[PDB]
Design a protein around this ligand. Structure first.
Ligand SMILES: C[C@@H]1O[C@@H](O)[C@H](O)[C@H](O)[C@H]1O[C@@H]1O[C@H](CO[C@H]2O[C@H](CO)[C@H](O)[C@H](O[C@@H]3O[C@@H](C)[C@H](O[C@@H]4O[C@H](CO[C@H]5O[C@H](CO)[C@H](O)[C@H](O)[C@H]5O)[C@@H](O)[C@H](O)[C@@H]4O)[C@@H](O)[C@H]3O)[C@H]2O)[C@@H](O)[C@H](O)[C@@H]1O
Ligand SMILES: C[C@@H]1O[C@@H](O)[C@H](O)[C@H](O)[C@H]1O[C@@H]1O[C@H](CO[C@H]2O[C@H](CO)[C@H](O)[C@H](O[C@@H]3O[C@@H](C)[C@H](O[C@@H]4O[C@H](CO[C@H]5O[C@H](CO)[C@H](O)[C@H](O)[C@H]5O)[C@@H](O)[C@H](O)[C@@H]4O)[C@@H](O)[C@H]3O)[C@H]2O)[C@@H](O)[C@H](O)[C@@H]1O
Ligand SMILES: C[C@@H]1O[C@@H](O)[C@H](O)[C@H](O)[C@H]1O[C@@H]1O[C@H](CO[C@H]2O[C@H](CO)[C@H](O)[C@H](O[C@@H]3O[C@@H](C)[C@H](O[C@@H]4O[C@H](CO[C@H]5O[C@H](CO)[C@H](O)[C@H](O)[C@H]5O)[C@@H](O)[C@H](O)[C@@H]4O)[C@@H](O)[C@H]3O)[C@H]2O)[C@@H](O)[C@H](O)[C@@H]1O
Lengths: 547, 547, 546
């Protein structure tokens, strides 16, 4: 009669296990599955284990192609596997899971095509002081394709002391090994907040920090800490990391290596990155370079990076990477939050890799560096080649660009100018000339042109005769030149007839020398060394355009 | 039996106030709450005040941890407060609230952690001509944390005439004083469409206009207008504002101050900003600079800005800001939409602040400026220091960069070149030498190099003798150089022995003077003044690398 | 009780019946499934459900309700989403499968704030078929701030070109609307996405038609079922950002230019690769007009690589910027394009197809990588007003290539260009002939050209009077603010003691340098008659040009 009909329509004894006809209420209801509904019957107290109920709800929802909505904060003790394009929706910002999952496994694993998680919380025990507790939050595994997590708070996954393998528990908040994984509008806060090891991910609009600063964990930092990087990337390819707020991390805010990883073609744009205990944006080789360990072709653009202890933007042994349009700065809050533990405090730094590998083919342009201590807003190490340092960089409010060696001026391109000095010597064809130490050389590199001023003051001679070159022009050794232009505009105490004047021209066999010579009517003569006394001076000016 | 059971299960007399067992149909339905359900029983006629019913629903959803969904457009007359992580979901794009909330309060105030509003509409009275009505739309308050409003039409909040305090009703569409607020995929149209006073907000992919151009409000614009900025920002920190379509505003498209405001570290990228009655993108100090009033370290990058009346991109008294890779332009639609009311029509302008504050340490590179009237693509005022104008800037389809005074070329760095002229004079060690007005000087500054050419045509003399200097080199007063090179490639009517040639070298004491001298065999002599007749001429050429 | 359970939607539940607000029935009427009464859509995925789904659509619009598609539903005519309706797919497997015929779309979206979340919109997917022609999702001219998000749109093809849109075109998603949002989608069809509206936003999509793995026979031709990832004509104020665009049968992202007036678009932070034409492609194929041009587009921060016929390509465009992009190749190029070589240039400027010049474009701060050592950037004859910035890094590719030395003064190369010329001498009377050993070198940096000239006479014919060296590349018809030349070497000239050669730019003919000499406290312009058949000198200096 009526009671029988109501049961037939899931109006009473409503279970998701039952078949109802499509015009029934029971059927309409079976489109949305709560784990509290029958036959899953999840607890709602948040203390009793719900792992079994939720796994069944998952598996049902996959089987019948229905939607899963988690309507409480549910305690679990084993990994939940979100697969087969199943979407876990959280009813509110307080729903999700709380994880007593054991070390060695994740709270949640997302895999398959187009699976993911909306909203809520995925919470670990949050005991960073504990010497036993080791957990991991969310994994997108190697099979994840266009999977996602959006709007979710993933916190409290720590693991004190470094793992030896993944089986130990690592302390990942979110670890992505998938293809095309979207992580957006999430809050992630764990030993390693977000770890990237996949391809074509998008990490957009997230808040990322493990708040080392306020943690209470004794300084100094060391490998035993429960507070590492905001983002840590190894074998990460073609990620975009945009619009994130990354601060106060135990190590670096956004890191790519370079340490058993081959990380290439990532784009890091329009992020704020600050107050980190290591580097802000950190691209670096710590393992030695190989076909399977490198950092290449990454674009760092339009970010605002400041007060990061050991440099805001740090490139070590990386190649073909671009740092364009970023504002990198410090203020006296640096001295407060890092009191006792002073860092390098550099806006933008290039350095060799751990095993000596050069920065090659990197492009640094249009950045605004502010360093009120006057540290060099950009630093360049010995060994670096093929890098371009554009003139659109503004270091007026920092120290000028610092280069570790003068040979860098011809082995890279400094459009942002570089100035230095050198001690000139003279090379007569025979005999010797010795120069007073009043004698100076100055040089400025601007792109592929170098300007030179050389003041030569002889202190003594010994039987100098024949041709004469000045030496040695910084950068120019083993280099050639398309054009060059030199004059002598002052001299004293030379043995010259009247209407004989000196002439100067780059030595085309050794283009780090300038040959000095003299007129003689309708020709010139290369006898200048015999016209020199122990009291002679001259001053030479000009420039070279090198190749 | 059956009646008593269906009542126990929520199948009849369904209410969210009842307790039901978890396998009941009632428990299932209670996961989602419509204010039309018992015990809220909101009116659906769109005309009856529902404030009380909706607030009950909201307090219930907070108490019990359930989803709220507005299923109609709902009249209200007091502020709805969305707190405690509650999300308001609008069932369709027609759902939401219509506000008759009175002056001094908002329609919707959002606060706490992870609270927000999806979809639908939030409509003011939309009476911009009214001299009485005053309303405010959505507020995120000082305790809002990672709250959001996404996908929502917020319109019609107006207030004719300026407010004296917030109590008066201001005419904000959306006003964010929160931390980490998201505003995305909204349409905001109100007197101040969007106001920013918080930290780490994300204003993404919105449509922003109060449609001044078609409003019918009588011109000229004045302080009494009901149409002000699209985005108005005071005390805004670490915002990213990206992908917005911003236009036709009564004042500026996107503005930061500087007028009761300490606005720093914001990123404005990839927006389109056009047809505004003040400026496109506007950063300036209207009130005096202080530790609590300033605009610092903002990034303006990749934007398309056009046909804004009083300039596309405007920087006034601001420091350490950048303007990189923007396309800024005008066409003949300027004079249609602004007929009768010409404004600056500059693509990128720097200015002093209102109280004369200098633009310091700004970076302008890689921008394309198109001005078919030939107005300077970029304008630099007197007082600006530490700024860098890159050579990546393309002003070929506009006027060339205009500087207010020549001394700017050595207090800033113009890689984008600046060319001018000056009248040379001769300073003899003794007597006087007077130049014809045919004598010319020209300088071109490129980065920290200035090239010069001077033509010296003497008109008279008065007992000249001793050394000679040409003066004064533009920009070079009180400056020093690391290298330079000058020659004299033409002379006429001078008192020179056979083989004696003129030499020229920068005065190292006063480095805006070029010392002119000549050869005497194996030394040189500084007696050029006396070698000079009243008909003497020479031409000097060279460059100075200044520090 | 049964009468009340009927009156409260607890029994015979239908969206047609009216219930009061406290009823269960009312609560359920907020969310509409087409499988619910009175629509009763089939669930087998093979029965046609058009009538059922359209009825549901009109209903949800009529009553202001939410429509959720809870299965994959076969259709045979266009579903029209209007009046602010959001279609919401219950899961990633729900949606529609289209056997709609040629000349119409599976789903059409229109009016204000209408859209589609999630699921699939799936075509016949028969790209080998010489009959089947379909189109996927249209936003028409009346779409206003509509959207599709979260959706897989695939399998819409049409072998052979259409004559009109009524033939069926092979579009995946086609946007003709204002302020359209296409995001988090997967689009894979003949033309994966097509753009012809205004102020659209195309964000974080995956876009490809997988030509490389298609098995369609090469070479490519107009008969192919694999064209562009993004095709734009009459496209204004789009942002295209965060997309993975790859392996397309024509270009990854294309604006024209071919019956299209496309302006003020921003293309940023996309990855673009392995396409069979160009990566990012902006050009005029039809002739330039007031309704056919491509203007003021921004290309910025992209990573483009191994695109067969050039990574970034501008042809006859104006006011466009290419800034901070990373453009590169590697040896995989030779693998995926074996038997079909292309240009293999990272960034190239060309004329439009009817000879139109690239005007007023901006190239700066790009990193180009080419192991073949092809020119990172190529500039054609005719280009005017372009600025190539010194922030570009080509150290790992070949240096910038210009087709003609004229370019150095009609554009601004801050990225320096070096070249050479044969000098001649131009004596006031007679003739001096130079050895072929004579050389002329130039480098242009900005609006400065630096020159080295070695002049080596081989024979004379009674020369006299003034002397000019000519012709300085680029300087024909130009003027200069400043110049500086010296002569630092000479042999075998007829010069008295204390007479040296001077040189200065010829101010009447500013591609010439006047050579002359000292004579006490004046100079004399008599140098031609001081030369012999074995005379030599070398001239150096620079011109700043206006
Ligand atoms: C700075 C001054 O400014 C003006 O006054 C003048 O220009 C003046 O000349 C000038 O001084 C010169 O500055 C040079 C040094 O520049 C500074 O910049 C460099 C980088 O270019 C350093 O940052 C330097 O700091 C010191 O050296 C570093 C190495 C120390 O940090 C340690 O780094 C370790 C390596 O780890 C990292 O690298 C790997 C890849 O290999 C991964 O990416 C990692 O993620 C990354 O962290 C790290 O393991 C250790 O724990 C340390 O953090 C740093 O402590 C400090 O000692 C900085 O001062 C100088 O060369 C010249 O001599 C002048 O002094
Ligand atoms: C431009 C031409 O190009 C070629 O032909 C040649 O190079 C030629 O030399 C050249 O001319 C010269 O260029 C200068 C012209 O300057 C133009 O650029 C400046 C800025 O650099 C101005 O835009 C100028 O316009 C005038 O001056 C401004 C100030 C007037 O606007 C008023 O501004 C008030 C303040 O408000 C704003 O500022 C505050 C902060 O202080 C906040 O940010 C606000 O939000 C912001 O709106 C405002 O209250 C008033 O209502 C006005 O809007 C403007 O009306 C106009 O008077 C423009 O011409 C010149 O220096 C030189 O003499 C040659 O003319
Ligand atoms: C490359 C070397 O590098 C260093 O070693 C040295 O510097 C050395 O000098 C150097 O050589 C020089 O390279 C010059 C440039 O050559 C290459 O770059 C150009 C562009 O700058 C070309 O890509 C060139 O390839 C040829 O010419 C093009 C036109 C051919 O492609 C065809 O394009 C047709 C039109 O379609 C396109 O344009 C329209 C707009 O009109 C739309 O945008 C379309 O979407 C777009 O596809 C197309 O229909 C046809 O199917 C073709 O694809 C190409 O086939 C090829 O012939 C490339 O080699 C060089 O000029 C100089 O001679 C030196 O050799």
């Amino acid at each position: 009669m009526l009671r029988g009909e109501l049961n037939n329509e899931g109006v009473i004894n409503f279970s998701h296990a039952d078949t109802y006809g499509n015009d029934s209420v029971g059927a309409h209801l079976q489109n949305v599955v709560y784990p509290t509904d029958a036959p899953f019957n999840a607890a709602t107290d948040g203390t009793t284990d719900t792992t079994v109920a939720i796994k069944s709800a998952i598996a049902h929802c996959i089987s019948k192609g229905k939607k899963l909505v988690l309507n409480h904060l549910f305690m679990i003790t084993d990994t939940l596997v979100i697969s087969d394009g199943l979407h876990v929706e959280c009813l509110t910002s307080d729903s999700g899971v709380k994880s007593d999952v054991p070390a060695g496994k994740f709270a949640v694993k997302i895999t398959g095509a187009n699976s993911g998680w909306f909203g809520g919380k995925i919470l670990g025990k949050n005991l960073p002081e504990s010497t036993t507790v080791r957990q991991d939050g969310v994994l997108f595994d190697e099979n994840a394709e266009y999977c996602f997590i959006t709007g979710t708070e993933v916190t409290g996954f720590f693991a004190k002391g470094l793992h030896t393998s993944d089986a130990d528990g690592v302390g990942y908040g979110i670890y992505d090994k998938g293809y095309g994984t979207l992580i957006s509008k999430c809050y992630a806060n764990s030993k390693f907040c977000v770890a990237l090891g996949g391809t074509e991910g998008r990490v957009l609009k997230n808040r990322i920090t493990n708040n080392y600063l306020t943690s209470g964990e004794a300084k100094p930092w060391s490998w035993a800490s429960n507070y590492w990087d905001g983002i840590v990337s190894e074998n990460a390819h073609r990620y975009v990391i945009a619009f994130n707020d990354v601060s106060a991390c135990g190590q670096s805010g956004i890191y790519f290596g370079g340490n058993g990883g081959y990380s290439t073609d990532n784009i890091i744009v329009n992020n704020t990155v600050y107050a980190c205990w290591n580097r802000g944006i950190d691209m670096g080789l710590f393992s030695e370079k190989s076909a399977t360990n490198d950092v290449l072709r990454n674009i760092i653009k339009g970010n605002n990076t400041y007060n990061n202890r050991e440099n805001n933007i740090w490139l070590a042994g990386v190649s073909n990477c671009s740092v364009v349009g970023n504002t990198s700065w410090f203020d006296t809050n640096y001295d407060v939050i890092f009191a006792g533990y002073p860092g390098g405090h550099i806006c933008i730094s290039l350095a060799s890799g751990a095993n000596g590998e050069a920065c090659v083919g990197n492009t640094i342009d249009s950045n605004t560096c502010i360093d009120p201590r006057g540290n060099a807003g950009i630093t360049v190490p010995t060994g670096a080649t093929g890098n371009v340092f554009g003139s659109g960089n503004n270091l007026s409010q920092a120290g000028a660009i610092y280069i570790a060696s003068p040979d860098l001026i011809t082995s890279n391109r400094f459009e942002l100018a570089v100035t230095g000095s050198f001690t000139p010597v003279l090379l007569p064809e025979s005999g010797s000339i010795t120069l007073s130490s009043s004698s100076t050389g100055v040089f400025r590199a601007t792109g592929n042109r170098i300007d030179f001023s050389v003041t030569v003051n002889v202190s003594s001679i010994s039987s100098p005769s024949g041709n004469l070159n000045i030496a040695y022009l910084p950068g120019m050794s083993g280099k050639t030149s398309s054009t060059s232009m030199f004059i002598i505009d002052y001299w004293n105490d030379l043995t010259l007839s009247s209407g004989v004047i000196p002439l100067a021209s780059l030595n085309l066999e050794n283009q780090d020398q300038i040959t000095v010579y003299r007129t003689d009517g309708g020709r010139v003569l290369y006898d200048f060394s015999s016209l020199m006394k122990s009291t002679s001076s001259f001053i030479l000016k000009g420039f070279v355009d090198f190749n």
